[PDB]
Amino acid sequence: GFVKVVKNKAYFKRYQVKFRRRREGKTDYYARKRLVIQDKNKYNTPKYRMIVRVTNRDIICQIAYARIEGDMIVCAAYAHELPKYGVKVGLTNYAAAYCTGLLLARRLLNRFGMDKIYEGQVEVTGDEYNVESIDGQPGAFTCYLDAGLARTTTGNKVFGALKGAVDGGLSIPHSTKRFPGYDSESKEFNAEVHRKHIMGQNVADYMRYLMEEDEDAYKKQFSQYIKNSVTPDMMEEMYKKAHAAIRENPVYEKKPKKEVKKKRWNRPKMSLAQKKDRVAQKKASFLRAQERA
């Protein structure tokens, strides 16, 4: 009885609800319509999107195009699926982003029957490489990077996935600005610290430095590096072999697992009869407690 209430009946009655995904805050519809909408005078040509997402544990990478029923996705990459060859520890980092981008590139190219042509960059390096179509061959695949809500700042892992793609053989337009090799004040691209971050010298030097400063903070930091005995060295060749295996076979297969039952883990919505019984027996219990006195 002090202040007028805000969330009253009328406010709800005229409140408007945003889109489901906007309310969950998972899709910026402004930029989404900005990215995915194909021109009108093409009518069937899908504007492919390289969708990259940062997960506290994983890295999501997929190539999608939207239709009326929803988005159509041709192929996807998963950092949790990455260790099935090559690297086994150090996921959801920049090196992981580049590797999984290259993996997605290669598996798209294979499932397009196109992997042989447009090798991309077999040799990994931090400089600029943008693929070109070759005459007499099917046109080079192009797509754009669907950054999403992530703050696209120079040196963001999503750009690492983009570099993995462009080295893989995808023509994604991009300036040479948002990479570790770029210098802001000097407007220059070093292109060597960039490949250092791409391959992992950026965490390699840090974790090798961390030896002589500490050991137990070392333990609490790279605990899964201690297991697998992941040395600061011997961390170049295994990334190389990861890339080699990416080149060899990027195809992905599931695991046949059908032995499950219908053990419902939730509870269903009770029917009207249950609500009526509940309210009536609550009525009986209340009236009984009162007549008890």
Partner 1 sequence: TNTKGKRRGTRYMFSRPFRKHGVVPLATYMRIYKKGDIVDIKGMGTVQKGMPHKCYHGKTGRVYNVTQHAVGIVVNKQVKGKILAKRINVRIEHIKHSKSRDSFLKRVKENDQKKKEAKEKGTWVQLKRQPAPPREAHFVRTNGKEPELLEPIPYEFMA
Partner 2 sequence: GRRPARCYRYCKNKPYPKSRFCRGVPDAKIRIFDLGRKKAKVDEFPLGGHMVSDEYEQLSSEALEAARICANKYMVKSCGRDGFHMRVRLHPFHVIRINKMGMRGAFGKPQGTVARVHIGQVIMSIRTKLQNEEHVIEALRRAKFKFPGRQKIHISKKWGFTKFNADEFEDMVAKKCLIPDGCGVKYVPSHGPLDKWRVLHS
Partner 3 sequence: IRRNEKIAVHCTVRGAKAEEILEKGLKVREYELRKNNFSDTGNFGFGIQEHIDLGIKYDPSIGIYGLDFYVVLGRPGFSIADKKRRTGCIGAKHRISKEEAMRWFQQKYDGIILPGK
Positions in the binding site for partner 1 (CB under 8 A): 14, 16, 18-19, 22, 29-30, 32-33, 36-41, 43-44, 66-68
Nearer of residues 38 and 121 to partner 1, judged by Cβ: 38
Q: Which of 22, 32, 105 is nearest to 65 (CA)?
A: 32
User: d(Cα 281, Cα 276) in Å, to the nearest integer?
Assistant: 9
Instruction: Provide the 3-class DSSP secondary structure of residue 20.
Output: helix
Among 6, 13, 25, 68, binds partner 3 (CB under 8 A): 25
Report strand pairing: 49-54 vs 144-146: parallel
The two three-digit tokens of residue 71, written as one number: 């988005």
* Rounded Cα distance, 99 and 241, in Å: 11
CB nearer to partner 3: pick between 32 and 196: 32
Q: Is 33 helix (H, G, I), strand (E, B) or coil?
A: helix
Q: Which does 290 bind (CB under 5 to 8 A by kind): partner 2, Mg ion, partner 3, none?
A: partner 2
Nearest one of 17, 10, 203 to 93, comparing CA atoms: 203
Contact flag: residue 1 with partner 3 (CB under 8 A): no
Stretch in the footprint of partner 3 (CB under 8 A) among 22-30, 165-173, 201-209, 219-227 = 22-30
Query: Helix or strand or coil: residue 66?
Result: strand
Residues in the chain: 293
Residue nearer to partner 1 on the CB measure, 66 or 87: 66
Q: Per-residue x/- marks for RNA, 189-228, CB under 7 A?
A: --------x----xx--xx-x----------xxxxxx---
Residues facing residue 77 across a β-bridge: 61
Task: Decide: is 7 part of the binding site for partner 3 (CB under 8 A).
Answer: no
Which tokens is 193 given? 């610290």
Sole binder of partner 3 in the list 72, 149, 226, 287 (CB under 8 A): 149
Binding site for partner 3 (CB under 8 A): 24-26, 149-151
Binding site for partner 2 (CB under 8 A): 279, 282-283, 286-287, 290
